[PDB]
Design a protein around this ligand. Structure first.
Ligand SMILES: *[C@@H]1O[C@H](CO)[C@@H](O[C@@H]2O[C@H](CO)[C@@H](O)[C@H](O)[C@H]2NC(C)=O)[C@H](O)[C@H]1NC(C)=O
Ligand SMILES: *[C@@H]1O[C@H](CO)[C@@H](O)[C@H](O)[C@H]1NC(C)=O
Ligand SMILES: *[C@@H]1O[C@H](CO)[C@@H](O)[C@H](O)[C@H]1NC(C)=O
Ligand SMILES: *[C@@H]1O[C@H](CO)[C@@H](O)[C@H](O)[C@H]1NC(C)=O
Lengths: 49, 99, 121, 50, 99, 121
């Protein structure tokens, strides 16, 4: 990994994320989408599923 | 760690922000196979395996299912039915040393 | 299966005309899309040019219009790239790119060895 | 080999029943508008059969 | 007249952990006290479809024998998304060493 | 440019000791493997010694084990090669060797000049 070497031989950091689901509870969860709540209006709601 | 001793970390029981990683634009290669990059934030997974190593640039594409090469054959082989993503970014600003 | 080899290039003075030949073996050149990419040390990869067999035949960068020309030869299965009125900023390694599909949804970006091009003002 | 047969790979939504699509616009995989220009997160939706 | 952790003879080696959780910090009196019982701590442990549920309840009582007459309900305390397989258990008790 | 130089050696009587120095410029010695080979007049070349920074510390030929040691220093970037209780069979030329990998998986072996070591009984 010389400074004057080519980009093809330049050092690259590689991380592979492998996602496994089994007969076990899901542990890692993505961020939730939060929308401002409104009251006294006929609206569609979704609270924790 | 070295590619032949690729570092494995287990991730569980937390909230993982993949929108920022997808929108970071600081990674040269971002290839997800078997998963939707936009739905990564919308799914829950039992366990995550983070597989970290350092290689050359031309071998970056070799870290993918069905790829061939010295690293793929002898260091880290991905199954044809692999379910996950690969994120590679240049480290010249951090891995440049004299000589 | 698919083999791509690049020939041509080198160092030239600006304003001349240069030839690049990408020889392809294992598949006819008449396909969905043949691309040409360039890479320079210290910057990310970007799409440079492409040629298609459907719809619009050729696509180029907005800043390179009218300077680079591409063509194909089915008889000997080659891709010809003629570049004229080059600029010193174009010094980079060029690759001819094709995309292939696997049985298990894998997609391969087959490239060649590439040729180095330098332009002197 | 024959690559004359083409199939569309990227589209915003699924096709309605008995729909025909012939557009060759570059699909915007990311947030940067392709504007007919390929690159990162910008790929040609058509692919040939091997 | 002080008590401090001296021996942990529960295990000899910990290999390939998958989960660790820590509750709220506190400081509980470890000094041995004699007399009649005054605290009744009830717990329920369940292991259903990957979840280890622990329900708890604490009750101060003024008695010397049997259980309190009144009715007390156990509130949920902790849920474990672990998914390990359990058929046996045991209680870990802290002995006392002194002159 | 990578340049390797060997210092030491000469003619010595039986029972003596020697200290060769392999000095490399252009790359640190902290890498995969350094090798040392022996060439005798009119005899076949064979691998002798190798020092590694990973896995097994060092490997030696079956004829040189137990009487021969090696050490490396990255700060001054040189390898010391100590031999004690020399034998007449050790009279040969010492070669210091390193290896590198190219872009197309081609291996380039940087060969050393070597030094003559003669042991007289
Ligand atoms: C390291 O952390 C930083 C911030 O915690 C991450 O964010 C980028 O960092 C680089 C350089 O540190 C900046 O140029 C960018 O502007 C930051 N933001 C984005 C969106 O890229 C960074 O991604 C982390 N990883 C690395 C390898 O730097
Ligand atoms: C009592 O003394 C021991 C050693 O003399 C010390 O380790 C311990 O912390 C002391 N206890 C307190 C409460 O200070
Ligand atoms: C870690 O690997 C698997 C996963 O639980 C298991 O079989 C093994 O016993 C674990 N512990 C080790 C390898 O020490
Ligand atoms: C627990 O027992 C074995 C492992 O000890 C396992 O094969 C079995 O499926 C488990 N049973 C349940 C009900 O999870």
């Amino acid at each position: 990994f010389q400074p004057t070497n080519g980009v093809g031989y330049q050092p690259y950091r590689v991380v592979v994320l492998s996602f496994e689901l089994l007969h076990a509870p899901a542990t890692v969860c993505g961020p939730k989408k939060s929308t401002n709540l409104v009251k006294n209006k006929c609206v569609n709601f979704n609270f924790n599923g | 760690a070295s590619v032949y001793a690729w570092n494995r970390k287990r991730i569980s029981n937390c909230v993982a922000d993949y929108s920022v990683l997808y929108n970071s634009a600081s990674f040269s290669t971002f290839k997800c196979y078997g998963v939707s990059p936009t739905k990564l934030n919308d799914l829950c997974f039992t366990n995550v395996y983070a597989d970290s190593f350092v290689i050359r640039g031309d071998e970056v594409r070799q870290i993918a299912p069905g790829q061939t090469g010295k690293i793929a054959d002898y260091n880290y082989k991905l199954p044809d039915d692999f379910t996950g993503c690969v994120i590679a970014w240049n480290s010249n600003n951090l891995d440049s040393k004299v000589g | 299966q698919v083999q791509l080899v690049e020939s041509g290039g080198g160092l030239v003075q600006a304003g001349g005309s240069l030839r690049l030949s990408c020889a392809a073996s294992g598949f006819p050149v008449y396909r969905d899309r043949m691309a040409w990419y360039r890479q320079a040390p210290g910057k990310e990869r970007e799409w440079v040019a492409a040629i298609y067999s459907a719809g619009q035949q050729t696509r180029y960068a907005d800043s390179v219009k009218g300077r680079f020309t591409i063509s194909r030869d089915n008889a000997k299965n080659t891709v010809y790239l003629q570049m004229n009125s080059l600029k010193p900023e174009d010094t980079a390694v060029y690759y001819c790119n094709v995309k292939d599909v696997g049985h298990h949804y894998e997609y391969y970006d087959y490239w060649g060895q590439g040729t180095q091009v330098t332009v002197s003002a | 080999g024959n690559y004359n047969y083409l199939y569309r790979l990227f589209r915003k939504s699924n096709l309605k029943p008995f729909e025909r699509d012939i557009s060759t616009e570059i699909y915007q995989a990311g947030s940067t508008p392709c504007n007919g220009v390929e690159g990162f997160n910008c790929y040609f939706p058509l692919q040939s059969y091997g | 007249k002080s008590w401090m952790e001296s021996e942990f003879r529960v295990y000899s080696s910990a290999n390939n952990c998958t989960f660790e959780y820590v509750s709220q910090p506190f400081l509980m009196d470890l000094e041995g006290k004699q007399g009649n019982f005054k605290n009744l701590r009830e717990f329920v442990f369940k292991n259903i479809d990957g979840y280890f549920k622990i329900y708890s309840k604490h009750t101060p009582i003024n008695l010397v024998r049997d259980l309190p007459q009144g009715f007390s309900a156990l509130e949920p305390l902790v849920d474990l998304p672990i998914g390990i397989n359990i058929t046996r258990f045991q209680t870990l008790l802290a002995l006392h060493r002194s002159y």
